[PDB]
């Protein structure tokens, strides 16, 4: 749940000379004293309970363990990591509204992928290199990079379709129906020579994926809202 995480860091106190038959560790109070505490500014103290632990199967083991339940203050990492990540992710769907004549689809999608990969690597450098769990922010970034790779492939296909002319390609009837009569009606396009017919087919293809990505990237808040 980083950067909205709560840590549980313990402090175990024993005598490394005398066992239970020689000394008995006892707690003066059931919590650690905060009578002269200096607040952190990055971490919040939630609870500092102390517990005296014995071993029923040892009889020579005693320890006093404190649990430091600390809660991170998330404003710093929110501002410096989560807002930039959301800003970059919001650019993942623009490639499907960019006209193919602009000649800049590849630039946009590749830049988005590069930024997401960089943010993923930075997050990796922040958190410990443990394999027990993945940060939800890391999972969301990874899902977005998979989507952006899919978008790069789709944009390559759309660009290939856009630059087709009667002198090089022939439009099969199944295309002339599916992508010029049926689908445009579904997506509320309403088409108003043949070289321009190929241009429209590309326009329909990337309009379809604009809808798909919006639903996937709006239901992608179900994987982000669950964090805070």
């Amino acid at each position: 749940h980083f950067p909205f995480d709560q840590q549980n860091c313990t402090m175990k106190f024993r005598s490394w000379t005398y066992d239970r038959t020689e000394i008995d560790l006892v707690l003066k109070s059931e919590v650690a004293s905060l009578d002269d505490f200096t607040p952190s500014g990055e971490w919040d103290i939630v609870a500092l309970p102390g517990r005296r632990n014995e071993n029923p199967d040892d009889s020579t083991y005693v320890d006093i363990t404190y649990d430091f339940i600390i809660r991170r203050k998330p404003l710093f990492y929110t501002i410096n990591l989560i807002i930039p990540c959301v800003l970059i992710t919001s650019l993942a769907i623009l490639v499907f509204y960019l006209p193919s004549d602009c000649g800049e689809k590849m630039t946009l999608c590749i830049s988005v992928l590069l930024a997401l990969t960089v943010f993923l690597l930075l997050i990796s450098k922040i958190v410990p290199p443990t394999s027990l769990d993945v940060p939800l922010v890391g999972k969301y970034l990874m899902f977005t990079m998979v989507l952006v790779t899919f978008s790069i492939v789709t944009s390559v296909c759309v660009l290939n379709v856009h630059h087709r002319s009667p002198t090089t390609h022939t439009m099969a009837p199944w295309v002339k129906v599916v992508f010029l009569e049926k689908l445009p009606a579904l997506l509320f396009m309403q088409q108003p020579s043949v070289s321009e017919d190929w241009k429209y087919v590309a326009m329909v293809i990337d309009r379809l994926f604009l809808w798909i990505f919006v639903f996937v990237c709006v239901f992608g808040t179900i994987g982000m809202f669950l964090q805070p």
Partner: antibody
Amino acid sequence: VQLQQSGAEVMKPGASVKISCKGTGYTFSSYWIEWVKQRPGHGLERIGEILPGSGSTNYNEKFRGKATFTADKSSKTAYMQLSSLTSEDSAVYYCARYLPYYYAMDYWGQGTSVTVSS
Amino acid sequence: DVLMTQTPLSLPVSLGDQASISCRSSQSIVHSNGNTYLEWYLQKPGQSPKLLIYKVSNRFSGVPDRFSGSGSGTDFTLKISRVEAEDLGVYYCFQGSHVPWTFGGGTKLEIKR
């Protein structure tokens, strides 16, 4: 262990009152102090909490801005200030000792009664 | 804010009759440590609430054994085996799992005759 609250208060609308809760018999600075409102009608509403050791405080959205918590470590007392008193603020206010994820609200104050009227 | 709902709002039961209060959560209040932090409070008239149960089942030191709790997920219930005149009051839920921590609606327990 014992939590002692201030006496009953009567205030005019638009004024502000400052209730106090004094804890003795335990590590005062290491336990959260939960403030609970109980209108004469019914219901227990949690105003918020403060950890006297640090300055950390939390407020329920319904009371954010209405109530402010402060703590004095020297004298083991925690204070709540209610601003812009109105008729609906007339109720009995309790202070309780809480340690999240651990020992629960086992000890409560006697309850301070506040009435808002002219 | 997790919403905690208690039913029935009123539960008339005669002396010696088992009582059962039910308590619902807007969302699961389970916690990673293996415990779900639900607490039951009784407030007799003109008195501060008294802790009865914490962590669903654990009974606070000094409460009669007739009280018992149980549940999981978003369903929890409190059972009083053999009610008694001193059991009269309002019983409240309290979830200590997700910040902020909220109280239940309350279930006024009365005796029928």
